[PDB]
Structure formats: C-alpha cells, structure tokens
C-alpha cells in the first residue's frame, strides 16, 4: 500500500463576489488533488474548524494538515480541535518559501471559475446572496469532476 | 466498464434535534452507498435543489436520481433544475412498495448516529444551533468512512 499519504493543505482567500461571506476556506487533498471549499463571514479559529469538519465528512480524516501561520490555524483552540480528531498539523519551515503551492494554485483556479461562472449568469460584481451557495457548489464540482 | 450505474436515491426526513433546521435531505449514491446530508428549515423545491447542488459537488453528477412523489421533487421548478443539469429522474412505479429502500435505511442509520453522538456530548433533546453543523458533519463522516 505504497500510495500517496493522506495530507491536506488548507488556506483562506478573500473573494469579494461572495460578500458578505467572502472568506473562502479551501482545502486540497494533495493525494488526490480533490478540493473542498466553504464560505465564511470572518476568519476566526472556529471558521477553520467548521471548514475542516465539512472537509472531513467529504474526504475522510487526514493524517496531517499543512497550513501557514495564520493565527486561526495556530490558536490553542484549533490545536485542541485537531488533537481531538487525532490530526497532525504543521506550519512547515520558518519562511517556507514554497510547499503551500497546490493550495495557492487551487485558490487562483477556484477564483477564476467563480468569476467565469458568475459572469456567465450575468453577475459582473457581487453575486446575489441567494445564488452564492449553488454557485460555489458549481465551481467545486467543476474543479473536481471530469 | 461494467461497474455500477451512477444512480442516487434522495429523500427528506424530519429530525427535531436539529431544529430549527430540522428537515434533513439525504442522498444515497446506490453505486457506492456514499451518503450526503444537508439541513433545511422548510421542505420546498428549492431546498431540494440546494441539497443536490451540494451532493453534486461532493459525488459528481449522477445519471439519474430516484425520488418519491413528494411535491418538492415533482414541481416544474425541480423538473427544470434537473433538465438544466442533464439529470434523469424517476418517481418509480405507482405505489412503488420497495425500491427507495437504501435511502429509507440510510435515514434511520443517520438518525441513530445523530442521537448517539448528540447524547455523547450531553445533549438529550435539541442540539444547540451552534453545534449542529459540526455534529451533522460528524454523523456523515461516521456513516461513510471506515
């Protein structure tokens, strides 16, 4: 069973077309390149935990999650949340440089699919709050399934 | 490629522990037995479409979806939503009898995992609104992943 390790890269990226819940939490399973995305009104430790609870239910529990040093990922609260689940976590190497690259690339693809799909429906600025959920779901389906 | 057909069974089931958003929309992919669950305040055609947009993003697009004749699945609105996506749909045979059985079984397992997990955390009645999301996510992770 010499298959890829069950390792995720998670990050937040802001997206004004999804306001008021413009902070998008994106997780890339580096074993499969699957992407999981959720929306949030504020970047807090808890928004990070809610994001991962959903990712877990969708991709299964990982062995480890790799994030940057944003404070929502390094607070005591998230440390304990992750210890509870049995998930290892690392912020990488001080002044990483690279190694968060799949997630940084995923954030950019994700934001361009949102924009091309939004504009396809006639929304050139903020998308109406009522259309957001389905539109986010649609972008995620597009980036995972072929 | 003589593998199972990409067919889903979807239904709604009420769950007072998740109030106010007590209507749980459950979809079983009959090819893999994967389950996808979302919560809603009201059973409407739209809640059905939002449920499926999420299922799609998680399990990919199915060839066909099998439901009962609840009105939220047979309104013009859902018909058009499904035509838009290219998804076939059937309410089965008049007075079906059986054939919605995986989804009926999934609804019952799902409701017992919610109850045993809720009670594990000390909530013997309604679960606090703030804990629901993670608790639903947790039940879904438990029923899909082993």
UniProtKB/Swiss-Prot annotation, chains A, B:
Q: Which cofactor does it need?
A: Mg(2+); Mn(2+)
On cofactor binding, the record's note says:
Binds 8 Mg(2+) ions per integrase homotetramer. Zn(2+) can also be a cofactor for the nicking activity, but not for the polynucleotidyltransferase activity.
- State where Mg(2+) 3 binds: 11, 68, 104
Top-rank lineage group of the source organism: Viruses
Q: Which cysteines are joined by disulfide bonds?
A: none
Domain Integrase catalytic residues, every copy: 1-146
Instruction: State the function annotated in the UniProt record.
Output: Catalyzes viral DNA integration into the host chromosome, by performing a series of DNA cutting and joining reactions. This recombination event is an essential step in the viral replication cycle. Has a strong preference for using the 3'-OH at the viral DNA end as a nucleophile.
Record remark: domains: The core domain contains the D-x(n)-D-x(35)-E motif, named for the phylogenetically conserved glutamic acid and aspartic acid residues and the invariant 35 amino acid spacing between the second and third acidic residues. Each acidic residue of the D,D(35)E motif is independently essential for the 3'-processing and strand transfer activities of purified integrase protein.
Q: How does it assemble?
A: Homodimer; further associates as a homooctamer.
Q: What is this protein called?
A: Integrase
- Full-protein residues shown here are 1334 to 1479 of 1603
């Amino acid at each position: 069973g010499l298959g890829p390790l069950q390792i995720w890269q998670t990050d937040f990226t802001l997206e004004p077309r999804m306001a008021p819940r413009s902070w998008l939490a994106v997780t890339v399973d580096t074993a499969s390149s699957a992407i999981v995305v959720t929306q949030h009104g504020r970047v807090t430790s808890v928004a990070a935990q809610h994001h991962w609870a959903t990712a877990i239910a969708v991709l299964g529990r990982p062995k480890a999650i790799k994030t940057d040093n944003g404070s929502c990922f390094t607070s005591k609260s998230t440390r304990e949340w992750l210890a509870r689940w049995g998930i290892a976590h690392t912020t990488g190497i001080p002044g990483n440089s690279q190694g968060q690259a799949m997630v940084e690339r995923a954030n950019r693809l994700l934001k361009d699919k949102i924009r091309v799909l939004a504009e396809g429906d006639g929304f050139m600025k903020r998308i109406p709050t009522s259309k957001q959920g389905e539109l986010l779901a649609k972008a995620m389906y597009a980036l995972n399934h072929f």
